[PDB]
Assembly symmetry: C3
Homo-oligomer: 158 residues x 3
């Protein structure tokens, strides 16, 4: 559905490219849509509150501070996102239960896996300016990702 | 047969979690059992001795110094560990012939792949305290691993 | 066809081993042949030039300077490599459109993936001495690689 390479050829400099630090973990090889940013650290309470809303055509971009000590997303939360039609999740942190994640019809990009789950006190901020992988994100921007990489741009692409 | 994420939910602080530095090279997605520690470096003679014994319900945890210059395990040694029913191998170092290892009914977690094989003089220690990936291992401890990660239950 | 571990057991110090910094992106597990080198940086013009020539029994060793900001090889270019029968490509740089490359009957070893394609000015040097991954590659040498690693040999370890 989304070929980031071709998109890069077409839109050239009008698109930002994320450093190659991520890999697919979800059941979808590629995905994209309008983003909603979240800023948290080893706590996915907010992620739950946000994924509780419908997300068709939307991608959750999580600035998890890059922590690989706690997984922000696991099978349950991923199932909630699928429940509410989210296109995908981009976690600047880690995921969990990878085997099960590969079976969920949703895109998931993260830096690594770790068996320990994050807390759920819901601390953090949503819809704020976040930056990671040498890229600044804002709710409203549009992101596209596939097995080759991840790109961000203000306007939708297609 | 094992789910490290689930176990972490159950045991929490009661189990240690190895830093996310390993990859899966064996035919088994998950494996686990009581461990036997081995310390050595770019030499696997000792491993031959150990794997020659039965390993049902056991996992061999090899502190290979994290060397990615020599492979401590290859198709031959892995088929031996399989022959002796070893649950799996966790190598803090490198493995070889990954294409063959993927087809073997045994767990294998290692740092990387390297075509050059390890020597077989036999130097090294067995049943010793080893530390890597921010975790210390002791023979008798119980290890569990899958595609999500590796955890160690201190016995 | 090629088992670099076995080759290492047989040839020992007569073969060189590249640092384990590469991953398989092609549809071919193992490959090998005489090498043609290329020194460039975020510009695949020369690669297209060289891949135009028949590459049966040949492997294109590309010193892309280790950049992962620009991909030197994509579906288009890899297809050309296939059509002209190249054995495989070893890119000390980035590749692109991975899902396409995994399907092509050619060996592809690269540092990583990145959606931004490289330029095509054609800047760079062909068939020159290049060094990366702790190994120096000379035009004419022989390279063999598989999922465990990549090794270099002065003389042929295979046929032709």
């Amino acid at each position: 559905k989304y070929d980031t390479s071709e998109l890069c050829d077409i839109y050239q400099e009008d698109v930002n490219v994320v450093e190659p630090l991520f890999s697919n973990f979800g059941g979808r090889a590629s995905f994209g849509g309008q983003i909603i940013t979240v800023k948290c650290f080893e706590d996915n309470g907010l992620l739950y509150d946000l994924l509780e809303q419908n997300g068709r055509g939307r991608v959750l971009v999580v600035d998890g501070g890059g922590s690989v000590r706690r997984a922000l997303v696991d099978a349950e939360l991923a199932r909630l996102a699928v429940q509410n039609e989210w296109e995908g999740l981009v976690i600047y942190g880690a995921v969990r239960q990878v085997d099960d994640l590969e079976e969920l019809d949703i895109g998931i990009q993260a830096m690594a896996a770790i068996p320990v789950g994050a807390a759920g006190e819901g601390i953090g901020e949503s819809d704020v300016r976040v930056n990671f992988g040498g890229v600044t994100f804002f709710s409203g921007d549009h992101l596209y990702a596939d097995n080759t990489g991840i790109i961000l741009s203000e306007d939708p692409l297609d």
